[PDB]
């Protein structure tokens, strides 16, 4: 934001480039340029800057949603171009994930951005399974840390992305994430077995809901196994 740039300028350029994505003749050269030197992952990386409002991230996520909706030869190449997400450094990916996963104190904009990110994760899952595996591995420790130290804000909506990511391919992701639940639910038990929590019942509710979600994921894995 210190480069003399107003958010409206970026909003305008994303609208223009989405509009030219709509047309076939323009999206042709769009794909040629992004396969030659461009990178759509840079636009997603730009949203990791905490100095910018959530509206820019909202527009960026809507841009991914729109291009993937238009996808469903240039579109297939664009879908395959996103496979470079694994090549990103762990720090940048972790920062980008924490930017959206963190519960805001723009709460509606944050919820819309989370829904758009879920839709984008669903659409991504020609990308391949390596990106999904890397994302699951990068998100599991963070979710565990958030459920342990924090009050579990956003945990009920966090499992939706993780289960869909584990659903990629033949289901290898459930081989790991479910194991995490094997601890996570127990941790929620450590949150609900206290006398104070029991007396209050007669963040504890959030812990119980997270435990219920983890158990539902485990049951979903078991049903597939049986």
UniProtKB/Swiss-Prot annotation:
Changing residue 27 to H: In a breast cancer sample; somatic mutation. The modification Phosphoserine is found at residue 35. It is found in: Cytoplasm; Cytoplasm, Cytoskeleton; Nucleus. Belongs to the UBR4 family. Component of the SIFI complex, composed of KCMF1, UBR4 and calmodulin (CALM1, CALM2 or CALM3). Interacts with E2 conjugating enzymes UBE2A and UBE2B. Interacts with RB1. It is linked to Episodic ataxia 8: A form of episodic ataxia, a neurologic disorder characterized by episodes of poor coordination and balance. EA8 affected individuals have attacks of unsteadiness, general weakness, and slurred speech. Additional variable features include twitching around the eyes, nystagmus, myokymia, and persistent intention tremor. Inheritance is autosomal dominant. E3 ubiquitin-protein ligase involved in different protein quality control pathways in the cytoplasm. Component of the N-end rule pathway: ubiquitinates proteins bearing specific N-terminal residues that are destabilizing according to the N-end rule, leading to their degradation. Recognizes both type-1 and type-2 N-degrons, containing positively charged amino acids (Arg, Lys and His) and bulky and hydrophobic amino acids, respectively. Does not ubiquitinate proteins that are acetylated at the N-terminus. This is E3 ubiquitin-protein ligase UBR4. It comes from Homo sapiens (Human).
